Amino acid sequence: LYFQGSLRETSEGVILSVIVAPNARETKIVGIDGTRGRVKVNVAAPPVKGKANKELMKFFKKLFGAEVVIVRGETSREKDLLIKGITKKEVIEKLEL
Ligand code: NA
């Protein structure tokens, strides 16, 4: 039940709610924010020219094997990612790897 506070399944796929920190040593999940209901994601890219957004999407597209788009928070640390055409059960399985 750990990652479930950060995700919900709509007709389109899964909205994965994250909070990023850019300029990290490695793009990876580092935790969960229990109050905000978001996965803490470090992103190994600078927050300029959209590069942290691009790296974030790339990481999750690779993890889930599905298209990932930003649906809210393009210019925020708090970003909502639509994982297209996937189920919550799939997403949880992959986040728990
Ligand atoms: Na960015």
- Give me the sign of the Cα torsion angle 21, 71, 31, 56: negative
Element (H, E) at 54: helix 51-64
CA 22–ligand 1 middle distance (angstroms): 8
CA 42–ligand 1 middle distance (angstroms): 12
**What approach was used to elucidate this structure?**
X-ray
| Displacement of CA 13 from its chain's centroid (Å) | 13
CA 81–ligand 1 middle distance (angstroms): 14
Q: What is the C-alpha separation between 65 and 84, in angstroms, rounded?
A: 10
Identity (one letter) of the amino acid at 67?
Answer: E
CA 59–ligand 1 middle distance (angstroms): 14
Radius of gyration of the chain (CA): 12
**78 pairs with which residues across the strands?**
19
- Give resolution, Å, one decimal: 1.1
CA 86–ligand 1 middle distance (angstroms): 25
CB contact at 8 A, 78 and 71? no
Q: What is the C-alpha separation between 28 and 22, in angstroms, rounded?
A: 11
- Domain annotation for the chain: domains and CATH numbers: 3-96 (3.30.1200.10)
- Residue 56: partners with Cβ closer than 8 Å, 6 or more residues away: 18, 20, 27, 41, 43, 45, 70, 79, 81
